[PDB]
Design a protein around this ligand. Structure first.
Ligand SMILES: Nc1ncnc2c1ncn2[C@@H]1O[C@H](COP(=O)(O)OP(=O)(O)OP(=O)(O)O)[C@@H](O)[C@H]1O
Ligand SMILES: Nc1ncnc2c1ncn2[C@@H]1O[C@H](COP(=O)(O)OP(=O)(O)OP(=O)(O)O)[C@@H](O)[C@H]1O
Ligand SMILES: Nc1ncnc2c1ncn2[C@@H]1O[C@H](COP(=O)(O)OP(=O)(O)OP(=O)(O)O)[C@@H](O)[C@H]1O
Ligand SMILES: Nc1ncnc2c1ncn2[C@@H]1O[C@H](COP(=O)(O)OP(=O)(O)OP(=O)(O)O)[C@@H](O)[C@H]1O
Ligand SMILES: Nc1ncnc2c1ncn2[C@@H]1O[C@H](COP(=O)(O)OP(=O)(O)OP(=O)(O)O)[C@@H](O)[C@H]1O
Ligand SMILES: Nc1ncnc2c1ncn2[C@@H]1O[C@H](COP(=O)(O)OP(=O)(O)OP(=O)(O)O)[C@@H](O)[C@H]1O
Ligand SMILES: [Mg+2]
Ligand SMILES: [Mg+2]
Ligand SMILES: [Mg+2]
Ligand SMILES: [Mg+2]
Ligand SMILES: [Mg+2]
Ligand SMILES: [Mg+2]
Lengths: 458, 458, 458
């Protein structure tokens, strides 16, 4: 209702839409998670994007890893930190100890740990601080009520200096307490929790903001993925659309099908073909993709239950010759496998290939193959993400389901009808959005040229 | 995006496809698991394959087992370690204690344990170190925050020496914490966890890489099996195929069936026969196998619900004489039992027999017998593995199911039809991939010669 | 692939098929289980069968029971130990303490416990050692990391002496850790765990080998039963068969059933009669059993729902006179009750009666009565065990099920058909294996003589 707390953009893909503008300026943040969960590179990316984009130097405090290993690990993501250290922008502070030697109590914060930090801040004019593994200095005393004053004096002193801070903490369990001692969540103003939960012999990374005092955020768990470019969080939200085309109807391979359905599929719409097995869905996918090369357009076919070479053989059996249209770079075949990764990584692969090839038509074969063994919520998230990315990029998408409906625009239903001791077939344009769709039920046969929709069942 | 961390191949079957090229060079690795889980021989195999293939000497540090027992245990797998000790390649270091004597604090790392290791490394020019049961030296003090500095100084010193290291740690629970003290996962760069989980009065071994800092890997649990040659992990992934045959259609036993189905089964395809009990599925399996001897080819029949001798009796009742074609080594019968082992063991037996006999036809009788009592995910993994190995080796496979479909290529349906107070039968080629398949529904009878597909039900 | 570890046969019924030849020679073995689970008599039987069969003397170390009580407890199983002590074969060593007195630390191993053991081994030339309740000497100090070196020096010293050793350990929980302190499973080479799990107000004993270093075994839980002769484990595995009979077809009580079904039931086959209640299944069982006395053969009827006297009354109502054929010792009736014991106890009773009477025909009435309230897996094991023992002994078996099928050879289906306001019946030989089986559906009535298969339903 009035003035709010100013925030700082982290430039991590997807985090700034979750926290409503970034992290608050001048306050600490706790990033706690179990082992192997992705919390060391969060601070690395938070420093790197701040240096590169807005030209803000930052410091990095280490407790377990030497700086050379940090630079070597960050070298795999593409970005180089040794050059930025040479330029005097970034300063890796070392507080990890010697492999041999003695100790007394393990030092103290205002002894040297905050003094060297403050000297480096006033020397490099840093704006962002990333203290990593604060649990590595409190470990020497199992004194759960004594670490409160240590964390409190650290957070208060860093607030007095006036720099944005990210702290990192370890867990033991996945859905238990937020940290080890059950103290740090009641001290830090901002809490971010990372999970790596194992269910059904598969892992799944999620991110969650627990509290930001004095401002608003999004509540719940949001999935992410560590890739070659770093952490990639997936948010939600519908931007502006240009859906009002209504006259840029495109063909659907079969001209007899386009006699039905009002004159062709809309350019920005989701088409669903459904039916039992062996009924002719891959034939419709093949027609839909192979029609695109006649207008000199690009198209991608994601196959999830066929072995490419088999697709080429069946296509040449129908008279298609995907190899020729693959030579001219008008068709791409991915030929993946459903259990090779999770639905999250599959969605990332789909988005990367769509961005790489820039097509005009997308055909995902057998969504029902991606729905075997996974949970219902994850599959629903995958379907919504794929459909939203397809409709936002103005791409005609065709999906195949083996026997969602409130999301798709057109539905073609295929089936078997037993006639006189023989198994025939039938086709039916079940629904459309904004067109007349030929309410008859006609039969068809898969000949040696393709589908041939015959007269009705009267 | 840039230069990555160089890796070292362990030559374990299936591990190099999971970790994307092996283990990182010059960094430690934690292999933690419960009792009896296969973590001692992981290090033995990691040393042995490194010596044999690439000629890299290595050292083995012991804490509980005397070297003679290690050599005697490794002798059962076929490989001999005493000769390699004589050649001066491998050096079993002993740090296990005397059965009688005294102690002070149990020694220390830089006292003698790292000094003898470093002396042996500089003496034998070793490249691979396998410290086994590091928990056997930290046990004397229940000081969970004090073992952190010990493990850290060990890992850092071994990194300074610059050798690839594999450490071994014990657990108490299966799905609880990664190790005993909840510390070692936050110290070591690489974590590998082995499980031996008991569910439904059956055991199942799985392997999982939890984190590799600075590189990529596969996430989740992957099953393995300890055999006469060592650990045999089962990866995933489809290599190059030669599916584009389309012309090397083979017969299907019954020439009347080959009048249907377009002219025979394809050479590289999966055939599924389905129906209720008593409808004649083993008859089709018998015809399919006994056709192969007419062209002087090899064929295997995996029986899972019949007692060999009963198969012989029923075959002689149909006129097959399996002894004659078994005497010429053109037919092999396995005669196994479903609850005698798990699905991974069954798949390993199938693969070993296929590799041993080099056949052209595989007939697995009653997949529905293997699916009783097991979980759904394990059965799906078994089906995909068997089908992938069959289609990779260019082998015609016939599977029997008693009343999957998206993986098979042809489907034959059998059923009962009650006509005029009598129970008849019928046949129906339900689907095919890349052929015309005679959409009629005809009856057949199991006479004293075999099946006789009669006219239609009009 | 090469030379393996030599093993020693324990001669316990069923254990030598699980561990592939017995226990390894010269190494310890941990037998841990909760209270009342059957681990004291395991060592007693391991010593006794070694003395009796292979003429190997042994020693028995006691910690809580005086030797006189051990002899008195072993006297109930039939075997006598006092005679073997007199002959100088068995030596029951005593280490249990005095009911009154003092102590210092509770002694020590190399003080007297291993020295008296070694003296007895060198005196009696013993080969087998059975130390019982090793937890009774480490109990005085709750020092879970200090018992490790004690167990280690005990196992190493016993290996140096060179005798096969069986140790016994206690638990508190059923599916928790293997022992009390979570140490002994990481020390001993061989681990055997006994369970006595309570589920559904019933107990069930199982056995499991967890690890044998350097050799192979069976993985999972295997049920056993303590009887008058000792522990009796139930393994799996199909030996040689003589199923190729095909010409010894026996009659089926009703001759009108025998012009159907090809000429009679096969002599070594499993017959299943199924249908609703009140349909006439016990009549078929009665005919099947009472046919056997006409050829002067033996037959057993296991009744599980009816009540002896009632069977006699209904048989005399049908004209059977079971008392006369019982007087000549050609018929035996068991007259048990389903909830009187567990499925393993029922299977053991069935096997004992079959071995005792040496019959030619078994009729188990109402398998569906044994399947009420039990789990699915245990019932499946019961069915497979009964069928395998019946087919291995060359015994014709008839089973009754009230409305499996992939294991039985013939199926007779019985039902109700409502005709014109009256409830009739029908019969149908649903399936056979290796014979022609009269595919019609005929009716029958239960008259005052027996069944009368009438004409068909056309
Ligand atoms: N280039 C990469 N591509 C894919 N995944 C990567 C890549 N680099 C690292 N990873 C993954 O990211 C994770 C590494 O996380 P990071 O080391 O930054 O923190 P952390 O392991 O959670 O920290 P800590 O070890 O202190 O608990 C691992 O799961 C690793 O497999
Ligand atoms: N040359 C051909 N002549 C006749 N029919 C053919 C030919 N090639 C393929 N078919 C037909 O292809 C059908 C197999 O199904 P199809 O490959 O069209 O996939 P789908 O049922 O749409 O879906 P899915 O790929 O998920 O099984 C069979 O019914 C078969 O008749
Ligand atoms: N030749 C073999 N064939 C099959 N299984 C074997 C063979 N040799 C050993 N095994 C099995 O491998 C396992 C032995 O594992 P290994 O001795 O390498 O380590 P571990 O038992 O996990 O170690 P620790 O005892 O320290 O916990 C056991 O399950 C054993 O039954
Ligand atoms: N000599 C024979 N004459 C007539 N019918 C026979 C003969 N031998 C076997 N049969 C037939 O065999 C059938 C038994 O089924 P079959 O052994 O063919 O297996 P299936 O139904 O394909 O599957 P399953 O392996 O589950 O039994 C019976 O219906 C019976 O009619
Ligand atoms: N003759 C017998 N018939 C049937 N069951 C018997 C017979 N004798 C003993 N049992 C049963 O066997 C078990 C006795 O086991 P045993 O005394 O050998 O060891 P344990 O009870 O497991 O040992 P501990 O008391 O040290 O825990 C009891 O369940 C007892 O009821
Ligand atoms: N003397 C009789 N006259 C006519 N019918 C009789 C006579 N005795 C018995 N029955 C018949 O016995 C039937 C009862 O079923 P029956 O005792 O044959 O067992 P079942 O249905 O095969 O199985 P279960 O004994 O397991 O319930 C009744 O339908 C009844 O008609
Ligand atoms: Mg880290
Ligand atoms: Mg398809
Ligand atoms: Mg070990
Ligand atoms: Mg069969
Ligand atoms: Mg006892
Ligand atoms: Mg009855």
């Amino acid at each position: 209702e009035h003035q709010a707390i100013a925030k700082m953009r982290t430039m991590i893909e997807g985090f700034d839409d979750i926290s409503h503008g970034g992290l608050p300026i001048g306050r600490s943040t706790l990033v706690s998670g179990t082992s192997g969960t992705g919390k060391t590179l969060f601070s690395i990316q938070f420093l790197y994007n701040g240096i590169i984009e807005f030209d803000e130097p930052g410091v990095f405090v280490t407790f377990e890893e030497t700086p050379q290993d940090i630079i070597k690990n960050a070298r795999s993501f593409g970005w180089d930190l040794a050059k930025l250290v040479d330029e005097g922008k970034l300063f890796i502070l070392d507080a990890s100890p010697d492999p041999e030697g003695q100790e007394v109590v393990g030092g103290f914060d205002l002894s040297a740990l905050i003094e060297r930090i403050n000297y480096a801040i006033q020397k490099y004019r840093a704006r962002r601080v990333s203290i990593d593994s604060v649990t590595s200095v409190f470990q020497q005393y199992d004194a759960s009520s004594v670490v409160r004053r240590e964390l409190f004096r650290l957070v208060a002193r860093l607030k007095q200096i006036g720099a944005t801070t990210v702290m990192t903490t370890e867990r033991i369990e996945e859905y238990g307490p937020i940290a080890r001692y059950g103290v740090e969540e009641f001290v830090s103003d901002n809490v971010v929790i990372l999970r790596n939960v194992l269910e059904g012999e598969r892992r799944r990374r999620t991110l969650e903001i627990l509290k930001l005092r004095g401002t608003s955020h999004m509540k719940g768990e949001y999935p992410f993925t560590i890739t070659d470019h770093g952490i990639n969080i997936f948010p939600l939200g519908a931007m502006r659309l240009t859906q009002r085309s209504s006259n840029v109807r495109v063909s659907s391979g079969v001209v007899r099908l386009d006699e039905m359905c009002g004159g062709g599929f809309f350019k920005d719409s989701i088409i669903l073909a459904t039916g039992a097995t062996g009924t002719g869905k891959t034939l419709l996918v093949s027609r839909f993709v192979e029609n695109a090369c006649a207008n000199k357009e690009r198209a991608i076919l994601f196959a999830y239950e066929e072995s490419r070479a088999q697709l080429l053989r069946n296509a040449y059996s129908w008279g298609m010759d995907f190899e020729e249209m693959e030579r001219q770079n008008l068709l791409k075949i991915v030929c993946a496998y459903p259990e090779s990764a999770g639905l999250e990584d599959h969605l990332q692969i789909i988005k990367s290939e769509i961005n790489d090839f820039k097509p005009a038509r997308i055909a995902i074969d057998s969504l029902s193959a991606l729905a075997r063994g996974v949970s219902n919520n994850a599959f629903r998230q995958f379907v919504i993400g794929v459909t939203g990315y397809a409709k936002q990029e103005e791409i005609t998408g065709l999906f195949t389901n083996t026997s969602i409906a409130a999301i798709t625009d057109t539905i073609i239903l295929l089936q078997y009808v037993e006639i006189r001791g023989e198994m025939s077939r039938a086709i039916n344009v079940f629904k459309m959005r904004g067109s007349w769709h030929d309410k008859a039920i006609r039969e068809f046969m898969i000949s040696d040229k393709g589908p041939d929709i015959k007269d009705s069942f009267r």
